């Protein structure tokens, strides 16, 4: 689902960006902890393309412990499975990367239109424009956040232990014995005190214990 | 000089293993020694601008870049590009010391790594086109995320000064008196409370939102 610190869990997807035609496939990875994004451009959705993409992302961000994707063949082929195994990266199929895709496309749109490109970006200007978008997204604050994704990526805040909370389970009851490690707007990461098991739950199902 | 993102050096070097895009644009941050490379079919103003935009996306925006006096660096297109980005630029003789020595060393490091990685994947001459991008990325990973020689710090460490922070910003809390007490750091916020940790006692408590303020 989500990492507690950077380079734990990434999410990756392909998305189509007609402004970047003819090579309009963008491979997008987001680090689920820092929100930093890496994007590369490709002519086709293939196993080879995703391998190049991840190698690029690793060069920028460092090597993750695990990557989550959908069921698509580029991600689950023998070639890609052996590639991930070689790099020692766990893989799951089955979101943050969806929001990353939207932010990226909005940014590409703003930058292109700013250069007078209402439709297709001229082929020779595409690489530069994509890099500019990536710079804006990683090196500038995301809306209301006080730190940029790249700052959160290299200097993350990771609580060693959190404060005690109760969580609402199933019987409608509130259960003690949990501590909160991350408390965001939508979700919270909570750890069971007896096992150190960590689960993600909606914020509304968590409240301070005492 | 001292400090990352102050002075970069950029050069183009030929790497026939990377044909047909055998011109490698190479930038090194002279403080952190971090290297970024992109490949190009020819040395043009467009290639230079793609390269620097890429390097900036990876490393951040530098104050200044030093290059030789090739037409791609001194063109009107590139002059105006640099100006739009607010980056200072100085040119020199190709190979010159004060502005090209470090990037010359980076060229050799990079080409040695490309050779070792390629021959390691069983490619003794030209690297298959479909494998080139990945191999360049792997070379950047190896050059930036591992220590150069006797260094205790990797270029990534010098560039970003990584660390893990274990608490949020300092805060002060309103205690029973009306006094605002310093010596606390916030851990998380939720449901109208802040969880705060006392720097001196390590006590962690939940405090109503309205009774917590940032400390200076």
Numbering used by the authors:
A (entry chain A): 52 to 145, 154 to 269
B (entry chain B): 54 to 269
Pull text from the paper.
The following permanent integration of this viral DNA by the viral-encoded integrase (IN) into the host chromosome is a necessary step in virus replication. In most retrovirus systems, IN first removes a dinucleotide from both termini of the linear blunt-ended viral DNA (∼10 kb), termed 3′ OH processing. Next, the same active sites catalyze the concerted transesterification reactions of the nascent 3′ OH groups into the cell DNA. RSV IN consists of the N-terminal domain (NTD) (residues 1–44), the catalytic core domain (CCD) (residues 50–214), and the C-terminal domain (CTD) (residues 222–286), similar in size to the corresponding domains of HIV IN.
In this report, we describe crystallographic analyses of a three-domain RSV IN as well as its CCD-CTD fragment in a new crystal form at a much improved resolution compared to previous studies. Although crystallization of a purified cross-linked IN-DNA complex has not been successful, we have been able to collect a 1.86 Å resolution dataset on a crystal of RSV IN(49–270) cross-linked in crystallo to a short viral DNA end substrate (5/7 hairpin DNA). The crystallized RSV IN (49–270) contained mutations S124D, C125A, E157C, and F199K. In our crystallographic model of RSV IN(49–270), the average atomic B-factors refined isotropically at 1.86 Å resolution for the CCD, CTD, and the inter-domain linker are 35.6 Å2, 47.9 Å2, and 30.7 Å2, respectively. As noted by Yang et al., the relative configuration between the CCDs and CTDs of RSV IN is stabilized by a large number of hydrogen bonds made by residues in or around the linker segment. Given the high similarity between all the crystal structures determined in different contexts, it seems likely that the observed conformation represents the intrinsically stable native conformation of the CCDs and CTDs, rather than an arbitral conformation captured by crystal lattice contacts. We have provided data rather contrary to this idea; a particular conformation of the CCD and CTD of RSV IN is observed independently of crystal contacts, and appears to be important for viral DNA binding. Our structural and mutation studies collectively suggested a role for the asymmetrically associated CTD dimer of RSV IN in viral DNA binding. The crystal structures, combined with earlier structural studies and our in vitro functional analyses, suggest that the asymmetric interaction between the two CTDs is an essential feature of an RSV IN dimer for viral DNA binding and catalysis, whereas the highly flexible NTD is required for IN tetramerization to promote concerted integration.
